[PDB]
Amino acid sequence: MKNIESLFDYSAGQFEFIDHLLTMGVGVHFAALIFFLVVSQFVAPKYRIATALSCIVMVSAGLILNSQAVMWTDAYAYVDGSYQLQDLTFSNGYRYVNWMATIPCLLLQLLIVLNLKGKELFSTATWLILAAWGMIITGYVGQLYEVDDIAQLMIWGAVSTAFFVVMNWIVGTKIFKNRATMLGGTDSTITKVFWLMMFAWTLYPIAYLVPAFMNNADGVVLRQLLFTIADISSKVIYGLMITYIAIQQSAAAGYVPAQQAL
């Protein structure tokens, strides 16, 4: 009742498009899961956790997308020519709770392929996860108000954006100060990963703001479309680049299965 999805009836085309976006997302993540599983054998032990983290992200995201898809079809019924709310079973808040788990995984795999270790790894991961959790929690509280109090959504979103900026500064600083340690020419690749991250993660706050500038049923569809683009880019495409970097550095370090795979 606190999310704008509950305010509207949906045309068959809007309802089925959203359903198909979510089910397509389930398929893409679980297909990618198999890919990350199979190629982990070609990654040196030093980096293999990075590919395992992608597996964890795929199943985490895939399970939440599957849950959203079933909640969506549980919540609405086709009555008198439109899909109408029947039960209070759909909200975006499950995405937020999940980010508490997947964002730390996405950040950790980056730090691993940057060749951080020991105390710097643990210390950097700690500040990044705290910043990320601060971002997610303040965003979560904000979107509880996307119907009733847009001013409060904006203020919680400003606080959340401050955490996002500081998090990105930490990430960027570590990348640019450590890319000279990277093997196999991946010092070039990692810079592209950072820009991909900036682009993809910025789509989420744009989706967060849809209630402020497109509070109608098409805005609900747009938000799910943006989430879908952002999820695939920030998790799947990002994971593929992380895995490429891990295998390339593994090969340059003399791991034979990596050398043969490439």
Ligand X SMILES: CCCCCCCC/C=C\CCCCCCCC(=O)OC[C@H](O)CO
Ligand Y SMILES: CCCCCCCC/C=C\CCCCCCCC(=O)O
Specify whether the CB–CB gap between 103 and 67 falls below 8 A: no
Residue 161 or 259: the one with the smaller Cβ distance to ligand X is 161
> Tokens at residue 111, please?
């730090």
What is the spatial distance between Cα 235 and Cα 32, in angstroms, rounded to a whole number? Answer: 10
Interface segment toward ligand X; rule CB under 6 A; list 54-62, 64-72, 158-166, 230-238: 158-166
The dihedral built from the CA positions of residue 133, 137, 142 and 146, taken in this order, carries a sign that is positive
Residue 78 or 127: the one with the smaller Cβ distance to ligand X is 127
Is 150 near ligand Y (CB under 6 A)? yes
Contacts to ligand Y from residues 107-136, by CB under 6 A:
108, 112, 121-122, 125-126, 129-130, 133-134
Shortest Cβ contact with ligand RET: which residue?
Answer: 139
Shortest Cβ contact with Cl ion: which residue?
Answer: 102
Among 40, 51, 109, 124, binds ligand X (CB under 6 A): 124
What is the spatial distance between Cα 165 and Cα 142, in angstroms, rounded to a whole number? Answer: 17
Among 189, 201, 219, 239, binds ligand RET (CB under 6 A): 201
Pure H helices in the chain: 12-39, 48-75, 93-113, 118-143, 150-178, 186-213, 217-231, 238-252, 256-261
| Three-class secondary structure assignment of 94-106 | HHHHHHHHHHHHH
Is 202 near ligand X (CB under 6 A)? no
Q: Which residues pair with 10 in a beta bridge?
A: 83
What are the residues whose beta carbons fall under 8 Å from the beta carbon of 126, sequence distance 6 or more? none
**Nearest distance, CB of residue 193 and ligand RET, angstroms:** 13
Q: Which does 165 bind (CB under 5 to 8 A by kind): ligand X, Cl ion, ligand RET, none?
A: ligand X
Residue 91 or 98: the one with the smaller Cβ distance to Cl ion is 98
What is the spatial distance between Cα 144 and Cα 52, in angstroms, rounded to a whole number? Answer: 33
Interface segment toward ligand Y; rule CB under 6 A; list 4-12, 31-39, 191-199, 246-254: 31-39
What are the residues whose beta carbons fall under 8 Å from the beta carbon of 171, sequence distance 6 or more? 107, 110, 128, 194, 197
What are the residues binding ligand Y (CB under 6 A)?
19, 23, 26-27, 30-31, 34, 38, 46, 49, 66, 69-70, 73, 108, 112, 121-122, 125-126, 129-130, 133-134, 137-138, 141, 150-152, 154-155, 157-159, 161, 205
What are the residues binding ligand X (CB under 6 A)?
123-124, 127, 158, 161-162, 165-166, 168-170, 172-173, 176-177
